[PDB]
Amino acid sequence: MEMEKEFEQIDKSGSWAAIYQDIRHEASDFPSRVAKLPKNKNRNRYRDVSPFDHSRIKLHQEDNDYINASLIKMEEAQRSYILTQGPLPNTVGHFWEMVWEQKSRGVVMLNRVMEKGSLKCAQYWPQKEEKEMIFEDTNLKLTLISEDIKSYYTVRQLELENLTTQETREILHFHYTTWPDFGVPESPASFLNFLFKVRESGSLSPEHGPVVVHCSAGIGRSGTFCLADTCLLLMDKRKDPSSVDIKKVLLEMRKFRMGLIQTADQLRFSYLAVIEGAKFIMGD
Ligand SMILES: CO[C@H]1CN(S(C)(=O)=O)[C@@H]2CC[C@@H](O)[C@H]1C2
Numbered sequence: 001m002e003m004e005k006e007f008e009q010i011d012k013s014g015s016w017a018a019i020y021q022d023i024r025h026e027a028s029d030f031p032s033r034v035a036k037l038p039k040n041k042n043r044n045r046y047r048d049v050s051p052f053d054h055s056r057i058k059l060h061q062e063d064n065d066y067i068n069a070s071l072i073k074m075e076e077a078q079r080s081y082i083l084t085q086g087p088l089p090n091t092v093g094h095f096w097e098m099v100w101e102q103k104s105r106g107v108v109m110l111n112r113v114m115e116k117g118s119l120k121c122a123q124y125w126p127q128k129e130e131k132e133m134i135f136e137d138t139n140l141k142l143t144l145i146s147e148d149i150k151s152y153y154t155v156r157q158l159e160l161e162n163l164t165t166q167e168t169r170e171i172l173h174f175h176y177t178t179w180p181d182f183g184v185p186e187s188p189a190s191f192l193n194f195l196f197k198v199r200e201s202g203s204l205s206p207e208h209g210p211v212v213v214h215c216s217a218g219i220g221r222s223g224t225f226c227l228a229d230t231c232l233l234l235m236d237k238r239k240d241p242s243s244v245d246i247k248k249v250l251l252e253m254r255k256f257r258m259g260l261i262q263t264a265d266q267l268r269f270s271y272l273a274v275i276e277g278a279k280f281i282m283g284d
């Protein structure tokens with residue numbers, strides 16, 4: 001079926017939970033043996049969220065190459081994403097090592113450091129220009145260059161220096177700051193505006209390594225971001241945009257990381273975002 005009318009048909013019939021459970025039943029199951037090794041327990045935030053072995057990002061280190069991060073490679077859309085958990089106190093150096101080694105331009109953050117009164121990820125970037133951060137375990141230096149605070153999101157320019165080679169690179173930090181502590185946003189308008197700002201920066205384009213996108217577990221809000229982006233790109237590429245099937249695209253993405261889209265409300269929100277986004281692209 002088309003998307004917008006399949007949407008109204010699920011609303012009128014109130015069957016979002018049944019649709020979402022079907023997706024959960026059909027989703028791929030692949031091994032995640034490296035994630036479960038005892039030496040990696042303090043590298044995982046949640047015991048039930050792990051990268052598959054076949055798609056995990058490897059650190060370029062001979063001691064321990066493990067990080068909780070997955071490469072989502074979308075062949076028809078010609079887009080790739082790295083989805084990862086929010087960094088832990090003992091993985092902030094690994095996180096920036098990955099950004100460096102994978103040649104990423106941008107980092108997309110969809111959570112606040114504290115939500116619901118608890119810590120959802122480490123404070124992993126510097127908050128003042130004159131107070132830079134040094135990660136001694138991976139030999140990197142990180143400096144805040146500029147910060148632009150808007151009503152729904154903040155964009156930061158950062159400098160990452162590999163202290164071994166003295167090479168430097170400019171990284172863009174795109175921080176969506178207004179996702180509610182409970183539920184999903186009422187309108188997708190600010191989330192779509194944010195997606196378009198990431199696109200306009202070059203961070204999603206083939207001349208760079210894959211964008212790094214995270215929330216707390218790296219599957220819920222993060223899944224919503226890449227699902228919406230890929231569906232909108234496919235609607236632009238194909239002769240028949242109504243042939244894009246958001247459930248099929250989500251199942252394709254779940255071949256590369258488990259659990260993408262965590263609730264039926266997140267599934268409905270993803271439909272809403274793609275539907276509204278397709279009107280603005282036109283060609284409007
Ligand atoms: C519209 O709100 C509810 C609709 N359904 S429903 C009844 O269509 O399945 C789901 C139930 C839980 C709540 O998050 C949302 C999603």
Ligand SMILES: CO[C@H]1CN(S(C)(=O)=O)[C@@H]2CC[C@@H](O)[C@H]1C2
Nearest residue numbers: 060061097100101137138139140
């Ligand atoms: C930024 O990553 C560097 C960290 N080291 S490290 C942790 O051994 O100092 C590894 C060795 C080679 C270097 O290029 C990469 C990976």
